[PDB]
Design a protein around this ligand. Structure first.
Ligand SMILES: CCOC(=O)c1c(NC(=O)[C@H]2CCCC[C@H]2C(=O)O)sc(C(N)=O)c1C
Length: 134
């Protein structure tokens, strides 16, 4: 159904801005911030029917989520939070909200030119992570 076609593929992280501050706000501790911050994950996005799968593979961690748009699921994040996640499409942007411990963060993923741009926000702190095709 050509849902998410432009996101599908294998992507490599090529830049990150303000990620340490984002992680601090989320509650990531020092050692994990330092080692996570070094990671340059491959993000692999695929679609099969209504099910979207997003894998992230790096030297630090491999993560995988599979979901249906609009349908909440329990996610264990790379930093080991146990969150309730809901991912929707809003105007062509994948919007991923994570809830845990009365906290919330929002991750937006967009296609912009040949890049996939990820913006993540925790209170007033935004980080931008830019991926290119692998
Ligand atoms: C919050 C701490 O995150 C990490 O350290 C981190 C990942 N975070 C993400 O996949 C999301 C982070 C929030 C934005 C969306 C995502 C993005 O990075 O693009 S994957 C990963 C790995 N495979 O090793 C690590 C180490």
């Amino acid at each position: 159904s050509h849902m998410c076609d432009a996101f599908v593929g294998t992507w490599k992280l090529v830049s990150s801005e303000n990620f340490d501050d984002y992680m601090k706000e989320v509650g990531v501790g020092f050692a994990t911030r330092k080692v996570a911050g070094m990671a340059k994950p491959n993000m692999i996005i695929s679609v099969n029917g209504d099910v979207i799968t997003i894998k992230s593979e790096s030297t630090f961690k491999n993560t995988e989520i599979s979901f249906i748009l609009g349908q909440e699921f329990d996610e264990v994040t790379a930093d080991d939070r146990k969150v309730k996640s809901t991912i929707t499409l809003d105007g062509g942007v994948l919007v991923h909200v994570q809830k845990w411990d009365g906290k919330s963060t929002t991750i937006k993923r967009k296609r912009e030119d040949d890049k996939l741009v990820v913006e993540c926000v925790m209170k007033g702190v935004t980080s931008t992570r830019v991926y290119e095709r692998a």
